[PDB]
Amino acid sequence: DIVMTQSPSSLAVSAGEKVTMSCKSSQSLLNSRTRKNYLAWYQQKPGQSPKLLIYWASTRESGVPDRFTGSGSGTDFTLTISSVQAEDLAVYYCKQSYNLRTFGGGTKLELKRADAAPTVSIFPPSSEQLTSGGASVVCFLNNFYPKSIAVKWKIDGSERQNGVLNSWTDQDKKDSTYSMSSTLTLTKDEYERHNSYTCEATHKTSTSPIVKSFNRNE
């Protein structure tokens, strides 16, 4: 067992600011023969494979921006990012290769930006779905910040809670906003009992819910 641990588990930093993250090994990774620390850092952006940033604790891989600096020795290591850029959003892993290989649990780096209101769109069920006896109503909430958001579905004015499924994207690597999709699924029979379908979004960027709706009749 070489046990690897990282800190913090997550944090958020504004573009242009400095980021520090830590990695501990349960035993020294310093090879007294080679004089090298067998410690590497990897960057994994949302939906990508890991990418090598640093090895031998402090040697930057060719191609990696010089704002990334590894330091430390023995059982304690640090990855520092000066002037964080929006594209740096990712999970960062350290990894020992002194004795086979073991990854730490990762540090998730998110980016802080100015609050942004969501753009909200509602979509009725497609004729192809209704033909098969189902009816899904979809609401997209795009490009907002911070991540915290609430969606309420109302059918003919009353709130509907079951049949709802929600999903959030990771932060965007360009504009540092988030997005979310909410899908309400009904039988076609239940869908045809009602007229008004409403997606209501509660976000800190305004005091009134953002409300998008359509009428089945229309």
Next chain:
Amino acid sequence: EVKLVESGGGLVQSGGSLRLSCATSGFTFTDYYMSWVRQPPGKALEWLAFIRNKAKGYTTEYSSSVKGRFTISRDNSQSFLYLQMNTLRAEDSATYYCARDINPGSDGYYDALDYWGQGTSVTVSRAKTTPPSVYPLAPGSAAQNSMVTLGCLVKGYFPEPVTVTWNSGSLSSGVHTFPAVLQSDLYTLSSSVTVPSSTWPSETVTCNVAHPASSTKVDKKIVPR
């Protein structure tokens, strides 16, 4: 160009076996150790195994988590890496990556995993392979102008993953593909795309959906309505 490409992932029943493969090119294969690393959905990377290079006699090592159950091997004639997986369990569900590991004999020796494949996904479950239904999301009404948001709903499939593109990848900006959500042993995901009003419906917008486990290929044009 160093190239690593995993294949072989898919749905396997608990207790079952699966062999993953990794095709390599762009470097002298026998010069390098090769590693397999996995990552369960939403969890940390986990190193599983390596096989050493020629100088080291192609010997193998394994993490405790898979020793006795998995076997790593290599074909040096065609530059392939394999991972045979036996006695699979739910906890083995994950994306599996192959990575080029060290060449200790080189004067340029550095100790890292410097190149990684795109990964191949494995799901260990008794649930049934189910292809997605793909439905168009077109607006029912809108203001007098500007940008328009469309989408596709990819509903009721198993297992992960699916791929979604728009106009065969040619629409990439302004796309959001939402992570799939599991409910009652079927996944649902959605994808939105936002384009200028002046370009749709005058120009075609189509979502392209693939579900490897069922060999599904769908093109769905988003028509006004």
